[PDB]
Amino acid sequence: MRDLDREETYLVDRTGLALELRDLVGTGPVPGEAYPGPHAALGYGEGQFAALLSGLPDWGEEGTLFLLEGGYDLGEAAGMAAETGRARVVRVGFRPGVEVHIPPSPLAPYRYLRFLLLATGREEVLRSVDEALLEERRRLGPEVPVEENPAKFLAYTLLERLPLFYSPLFRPLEGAVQTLFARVAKSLSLTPPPSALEFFLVGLEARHEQGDPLAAVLLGPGEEAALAKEILESRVDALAEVPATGANRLAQVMALWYRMAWTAYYLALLYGVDPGDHGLLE
Amino acid sequence: MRDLDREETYLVDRTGLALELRDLVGTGPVPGEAYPGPHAALGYGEGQFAALLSGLPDWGEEGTLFLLEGGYDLGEAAGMALLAGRARVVRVGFRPGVEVHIPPSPLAPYRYLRFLLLATGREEVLRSVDEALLEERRRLGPEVPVEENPAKFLAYTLLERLPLFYSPLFRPLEGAVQTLFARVAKSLSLTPPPSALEFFLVGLEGDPLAAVLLGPGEEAALAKEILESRVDALAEVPATGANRLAQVMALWYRMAWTAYYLALLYGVDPGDHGLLERLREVT
């Protein structure tokens, strides 16, 4: 078993993802003008989660339509995105043809959301998000020992286990985290279907042993999180309750996301694999 | 290993889900009036998948708003009703206070959808769905041997494996099928995230995985090339039907049957038999 408190363990991080994670807040493009409303947003790859979290309509025939064509969108036909009426189309993505450029990164979702909140007059919400992530990073860096580092601690829980992520406060966070663990930790993880509690209650009855390798990760607060624990504690090998820091829903979602990003990073180190992306052309 | 072609293997099906699966087409409430348009639908639990399949908007200021209260909404349903403007609210679900009743059932999604199509003037679309399911049904019944029954055959492939469902033609289908396998087969399965293909490439290297590609599409073919070398077993499920909506429901129906047979292979009752009663009460 690798030791997250020993320098040697970090040599596999050849692209310095640890640094990017630390400096994430305040990075990414900023709106250089006031886009005409109404505002709409449709995202692909690294821009989908942000588009959803924003709560904006996914289309429009007037005002501004932000097409977040993000990286890691293999086969999602983002370029296919055709009737837009008199709406101004603003392309934000990694491709050379975009109007606002954002290079591909597992952390890009933060940047897309940041750009979007700023373009829709939600700088205040953005402040609470940045505030929440900054308070989180205090305990997440590699210089913070396992006992005081929740991401390192959680990584040891997920080591050699099958993570099951559930985030009642906002279901799509589940997919975003599953994506983080695949892309960064290069590991398999699961998310429940829309009828999650139902899934937890009867999905492990055929073979109770299916729960032996499971690590249920309950992300955030809510009655459903409580009911989920009541159902899963006695049906799975391990269960973690992750607090959602932040003064509001979006801040809480992003704080959970950011902590899981740090967790995926440490899990990659525990498996001794590079947390970074593969070169796609070499 | 239990044999799906031996009669005693079905004794555990106490509530007779095989019969319900067989008679599904044509069951469920029928609208008794011409609901004034425009139409909108918001679904929960057993009604969510159907709401999404209909393609109807999730909210309306005028006309009729169909609230598909299929469970687990923890009071939200009532809230939206309150929030609902000049739109007429029509509650469809299992609680005694609803306007249109649809009792709990793993197969209720079909019944909710049927109601919505009939309520929004889409009788012909419904006919294509029913036609597809009736065609599917011909080779899925218990009397159809394994060598000729796709659901029985697939069940054996999923036995003691962790199925991974991917449905490019309509991503929400994966979640609905994952639900069928938990409620009917009482078994665990998973779905890929929004960026599915990227996931297959880096995240796949518990029981061995069984990739189940649901339906046609270019992304399905790409998915196959990627998963082929990365998973223990891979199945391509063809979708019966003359249009996308019919194909989705046909896939869903064949998976319900598959989940049914998988439960029998594990020797557990595929029916609900009171396991969800308590849960519905506290949610």
Residues of A near B (Cβ–Cβ under 8 Å) read: 45, 48-49, 72-76, 162, 172, 175-176, 178-179, 181-183, 186-195, 197-199, 201-207, 210, 213-214, 223-224, 227, 278
Test the A interface: residue of B1, B73, B198, B264 with most A CBs within 10 Å: B198
Q: Is B176 strand, coil or helix? A: helix
Closest chain A residue to the Cα of B48, Cα to Cα: A194
Identify whether the C-beta of residue A196 lies closer than 8 Å to the C-beta of residue A170: no
Measured CA to CA, the distance from residue A23 to residue A1 in angstroms comes to 29
Smallest CA–CA distance, residue B178 to chain A, in Å, is: 6
**DSSP category for residue A133:** H
Q: Looking at the domain A16-139, which fold is it?
A: Rossmann fold (3.40.50)
Class of residue B55 by CB neighbours under 10 A (exposed 0-12, middle 13-18, buried 19+): exposed
**DSSP category for residue A9:** G
Looking at the DSSP bridge assignments, the partners of residue A203 are none
Q: How far is CA A64 from the centre of its chain?
A: 26
Identify whether the C-beta of residue B115 lies closer than 8 Å to the C-beta of residue B31: yes
Dihedral angle of Cα B52, B54, B57, B58, to the nearest 10 degrees: -40
Measured CA to CA, the distance from residue A245 to residue A228 in angstroms comes to 20
Residues in chain A: 282
Measured CA to CA, the distance from residue A137 to residue A242 in angstroms comes to 15
Measured CA to CA, the distance from residue A108 to residue A83 in angstroms comes to 28
List chain A gaps (C–N > 2.5 A) by preceding residue: 81
Element of type H or E holding A131: helix A123-137
HSE-up (13 A, CA, CB side) for residue B27: 16
Closest chain B residue to the Cα of A209, Cα to Cα: B206
Handedness of CA B3, B4, B8, B14 (dihedral sign): positive
Pairing state between β A214-219 and A162-166:
parallel
Taking contacts as CB-CB distances below 8 angstroms, the residues of chain B near A205 are 186, 268, 275
Experimental method of this PDB entry: X-ray
CA angle B81, B82, B84 (to 5 degrees): 65
* Nearest C-alpha neighbor of B179 from the set A166, A191, A193, A206: A193
Measured CA to CA, the distance from residue B125 to residue B3 in angstroms comes to 38
CA angle A12, A18, A24 (to 5 degrees): 150
Asked if the Cβ–Cβ distance from B275 to A45 is below 8 Å, we say no
- Asked, colleague to colleague, whether B16-139 and B140-267 share their fold, the answer is yes
Measured CA to CA, the distance from residue B279 to residue B272 in angstroms comes to 12
Taking contacts as CB-CB distances below 8 angstroms, the residues of chain A near B179 are 193-195, 198-199
What separation, in Å, do the N-terminal and C-terminal C-alpha atoms of chain B show? Answer: 38
Identify whether the C-beta of residue A123 lies closer than 8 Å to the C-beta of residue A117: yes
Identify whether the C-beta of residue A247 lies closer than 8 Å to the C-beta of residue A131: yes
CB atoms within 10 A of CB A40: 23
Identify whether the C-beta of residue B98 lies closer than 8 Å to the C-beta of residue B45: no
Beta strands in chain B (DSSP E): 39-45, 64-70, 88-93, 100-101, 162-166, 209-214, 233-237
**CB within 8 A of A23, min separation 6: which ones?**
none
List the domain boundaries for chain A: 16-139, 140-272
Q: How much is the CA Rg of chain A, to the nearest whole Å?
A: 19
Identify whether the C-beta of residue A140 lies closer than 8 Å to the C-beta of residue A80: no
Identify whether the C-beta of residue B42 lies closer than 8 Å to the C-beta of residue B161: no
* CATH superfamily of the B140-267 domain: Glucose-6-phosphate isomerase like protein; domain 1 (3.40.50.10490)
Q: How many CB pairs under 8 A join A and B?
A: 131
HSE-up (13 A, CA, CB side) for residue A256: 30
* Nearest C-alpha neighbor of A24 from the set A117, A136, A186, A175: A136
**The amino acid at B18:** A
Structure token pair of residue A50: 């942000």
Measured CA to CA, the distance from residue B283 to residue B276 in angstroms comes to 11
Structure token pair of residue A177: 């985290």
**DSSP category for residue B190:** B
Taking contacts as CB-CB distances below 8 angstroms, the residues of chain B near A74 are 195, 197-198, 201, 222
* The CATH classification of domain A140-272, taken from the options 3.40.50.1370, 3.20.10.10, 3.30.230.10, 3.40.50.10490: 3.40.50.10490
Q: Is B232 strand, coil or helix? A: coil
Measured CA to CA, the distance from residue B114 to residue B30 in angstroms comes to 8
